[PDB]
Amino acid sequence: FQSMSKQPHICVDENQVSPYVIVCGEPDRVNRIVELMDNVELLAENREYRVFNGVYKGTTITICSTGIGAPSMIIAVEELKLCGATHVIRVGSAGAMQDHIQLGELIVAEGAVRDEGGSKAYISSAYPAYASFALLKEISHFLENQSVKYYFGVVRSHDSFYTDEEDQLCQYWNKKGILGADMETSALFTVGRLRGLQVASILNNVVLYQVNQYVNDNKAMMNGERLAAITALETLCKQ
């Protein structure tokens, strides 16, 4: 029946999707982010794509999981774009590339090394993956007001942390001053920008670079997730 008008992966349309969007890897994180919003509604659920609308401080925002990886991210960006998204903020996870960065502290990517094939499918790797400065301004301002430590800088996005060369990759990138590594940021920044989106990425640190420990760690991380979501929500509701 109504299977003609919907985007084939995110399963939503023009009218459903807000111009303002948050994406994350984990479908179950979508339910956690909507907890913070009013007037929540499930829009679609398909494969790794879980899509909700919610209202935060008066502004209607769409929350969308995209699974792990640049290809699954790019699929959601293209289809969100077609539904009228203009501002998209990644809220995600990272492994630290500097030893001073603790669990549940935030990395805000100003730029990203394009070490994933996803963005390369579109354009020469020479094209920059960077965050919209208007969004960065707002993110910086929200994060200043609170106590959890956060770092602005370059992250690396890649397609595997499981090569035998992971150690050396880490060390090389540590010396270049990269803050953290994910799989999705540079693809958002590249494809998003090429489709005229304003984009940004707020990453929760979940691996150190280096029983009761476990519980505090998990709490720290869960606190970082919440902060990252709130920061993204605070930023989008100003536009």
Add this chain to the structure above:
Amino acid sequence: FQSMSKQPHICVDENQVSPYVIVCGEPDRVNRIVELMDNVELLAENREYRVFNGVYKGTTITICSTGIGAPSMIIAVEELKLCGATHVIRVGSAGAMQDHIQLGELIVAEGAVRDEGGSKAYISSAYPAYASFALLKEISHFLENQSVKYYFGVVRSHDSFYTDEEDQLCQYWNKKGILGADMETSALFTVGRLRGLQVASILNNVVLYQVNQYVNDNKAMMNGERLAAITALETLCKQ
């Protein structure tokens, strides 16, 4: 508690995982494949990873979804490997690159163009992505016995079907004789082989190269999925 011994993404361990494994993109396909098996048990559910064991014609086999894309595939291969997998068969979806291939017909990848960054993270693209011939032999033999049309040959694996150049990519690859395109096969074939797995990929055609139509199409596709799963099950239970 018991969060020390499990693989951090597939959330299973050595003892749970069979040496014989089927992977697919869609978590909901895992439930559909287990329908065909005895002694089914849910092993884990995490992000896009849905993991089950089942028994088919006496052999215990593990079924695992890996979401869409090479990075999420590679994560599952590495972790399945560490749990003792030896034979892994992709059961997935493809877009046709030749016009004679119909919906719900199967493409069996003998080889795959490595147009995804995932496999490139591991090794120079010059290394071949090809299917284990023992598995190909068995797949060919099962498929001969039945009526649904199937094609053996080269597929292309890539990170985006949404570039502005998709048309030209299609036409170029059509002329080279590629049968279909997916996102995951060449990564399985490359990483899998480099970790000593026997690997294969059986792909269900879901896009032509070119209301009642819709219902028969869906039936055709659902029939192709079932055939692909059965073929993989028949192949693995012989080892």
Add this chain to the structure above:
Amino acid sequence: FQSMSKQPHICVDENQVSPYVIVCGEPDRVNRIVELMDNVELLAENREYRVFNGVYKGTTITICSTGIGAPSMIIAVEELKLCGATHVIRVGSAGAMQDHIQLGELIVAEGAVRDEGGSKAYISSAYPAYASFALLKEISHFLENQSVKYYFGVVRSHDSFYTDEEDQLCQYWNKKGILGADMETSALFTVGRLRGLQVASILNNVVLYQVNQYVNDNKAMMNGERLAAITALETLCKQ
């Protein structure tokens, strides 16, 4: 005699150079920028490097020409770095890559395509060339207050506008949404960042993408140069 302590190309030392620096292509532009400052002093003059200190609204700033091209830019960045520079702003020239951009209007590079070999000597082209957001914030704020049109976005930096393929390069990059093209920005952004500098680039448009005309054009361009210099000065004197 005192030819031991000075940088071998910019011919200045630690004590001479301010942490705050403006660089431009043309040595004669250095004299034009110092016209706008108090307490001017010639520091060095060597090859294409013309170096001055001046004071603007209380802040001491160094002005340095670097000739044309990424290699000559990189030489000045490395040596300015060694003399203690922390903030460096390019004030330069561009050819428009969109037809709405007029002569003597400004392009502020948020990011830059790394199509020059200079930055590639240092690091894989996958590393992002982008502008420090703190500087971008300040530049945006100054430029809002006045009437001359200015555009924020991506520029392309390259090593030749004289290949037979220039037309096609232009058209390709026009469609990607690039605003202008220079030879120096992405090298500043890449090497500068890798040496821990805060960096930015304000470019004066001097070629349309498309006697009395000539005089107004020149006036427009000279007005853009002055505005670009003033904007950079206003930005640096706040740090």
Add this chain to the structure above:
Amino acid sequence: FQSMSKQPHICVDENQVSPYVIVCGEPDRVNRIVELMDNVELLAENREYRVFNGVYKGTTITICSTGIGAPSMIIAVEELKLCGATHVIRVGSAGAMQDHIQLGELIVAEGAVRDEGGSKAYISSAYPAYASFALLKEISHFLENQSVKYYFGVVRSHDSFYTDEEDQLCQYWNKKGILGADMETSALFTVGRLRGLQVASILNNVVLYQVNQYVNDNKAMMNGERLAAITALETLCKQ
């Protein structure tokens, strides 16, 4: 006179060439292979190309030397193709990349690393160089019946074993699990497949990875050559 209809390098035509073909490096090996056949006839002799027809167990097969290297291999593949070849099997020599492989033991290439420029002239190195499984099936079956040890897997094809880096190349490829190295296999597999041939490669080991010794070694190698030829003949006469 009749110098219009013949292929300019292999000096044969449509009518002469069988659909079933064996190629080898060494012209003098052609005479050794025909020793095993009935109804032998010299077809052509030109540069490194020595061409014969023979009959084996009822089937007429063409034997063709192609000298050393991918370019000279590719020339023979293109021209054999134009003469109506459909199945082509390389029967050649390899240097071992694992220490358990002895002299005069066989390596059957399922796939090949495309480290030669020959195949790259045709297509991106991402395209797979692999052997036709129907041929692999048959080769496996013949070789099972006899006592000489043989290994199935990946070989590396390259353009020089004389670079100063040969040692490190060897060690790198040894760890990746490559069985042996030649100069011709991946070019056959790539160009052959792109021209719609069924292809395979059976390689005789002639260098260990590590007077009376010399005589037994030579005998071992000569025995491997004979076995490789017989295996290829047994395989082709079944089609």
Add this chain to the structure above:
Amino acid sequence: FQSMSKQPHICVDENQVSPYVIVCGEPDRVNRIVELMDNVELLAENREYRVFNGVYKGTTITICSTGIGAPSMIIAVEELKLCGATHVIRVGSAGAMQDHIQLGELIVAEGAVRDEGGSKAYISSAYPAYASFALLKEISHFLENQSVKYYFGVVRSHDSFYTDEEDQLCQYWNKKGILGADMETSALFTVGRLRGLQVASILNNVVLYQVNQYVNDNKAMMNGERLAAITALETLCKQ
């Protein structure tokens, strides 16, 4: 017996090989070149390698065929080097890339496009393939004295003239001003130089770029071969 001291492919040793060497593709050309010399002796015959010594105007020179292609050329260069060669001149065949060049006219390669994988195995393609100027001087001087037309400039060396893109390759390279194309020159120039040889290449045109005709063409070509050989001999006997 004496199978320990000889180079494994060219089957000659230190004492046999002159410092001055001519190489060509075709073994039968070796017999044609020795026709022009005194005190001829067959040194070795192995695969595509046919090796002779002869004396020309007092100087002893070695003549060696290397079959077709860069890999087989490189093998002979490495082994000739080890036997004490210092000056090596290619005497070969080319296809014209400009329409004014006739059959049996000579192309003398000053430089060569490195479009073959052979030289790339050794060193980045950025390293120049060019001819020793001392040899070029002497070649120019001999050729001035006679009537057959000859052209000095850039040739292209490649691994296949049989790709579907040959036409476009030709046209692209024609416009760049390339004179002719072979398979071997840039490999000689690159590997040779890296091993400290003085190198040069004199190529006989055998394909236009565009019964009685056939006979005059063949005569023209055979005349070009003779001239090329004589020119190389005249050049080497001066050292």
Add this chain to the structure above:
Amino acid sequence: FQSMSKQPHICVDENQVSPYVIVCGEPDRVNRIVELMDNVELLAENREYRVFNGVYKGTTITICSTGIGAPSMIIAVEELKLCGATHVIRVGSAGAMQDHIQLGELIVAEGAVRDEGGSKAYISSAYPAYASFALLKEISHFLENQSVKYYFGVVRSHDSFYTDEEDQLCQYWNKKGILGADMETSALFTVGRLRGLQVASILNNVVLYQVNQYVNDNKAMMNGERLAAITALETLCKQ
């Protein structure tokens, strides 16, 4: 007024520029070279471009500085070409890549490694950067007659001697037998040749590979500059 007919960077036209040209990096070197000539006239002065005509032994020659780097070199080559230049000789500076080469000794580049992006903008790096042999002949002949040591061979042209990897670059290139390194030679050789110029490069050594010392060093270097200029002048006035 007369700002229509002049080249936009070198600020000269067809009638001003001689077919015979010397280029150097340093504008102040132009004044030093004209000291050696009769009938000197300043033609233009713009940015790093300082342009003069002079007469040497009857021949009128143009002297042009091009600042440091391949992009600024290429600009001058293109515009000199358009003004009718046919023969262009670089007279420049190098850092030694072999320890036997002393300060103020000359390196004459027969060929150049294309490690700069400038030439790559035009053509695949596989195209050779080499010197016109007619010019090399003449340069060799002049330099034989005098006492200062000079070396003919390969140089490397690059875009930065300030990467953290400079040491290793040096060592790698030392072993390959490179004589010296500059920033401009391979760009002249590549772009120049592609525009049909006869080209050459004579480089003065100013850095060893390894008060009174300082004065003799400077004298040695200044003597090398003079010799290089004279050699170029002697060479051009013969055409």
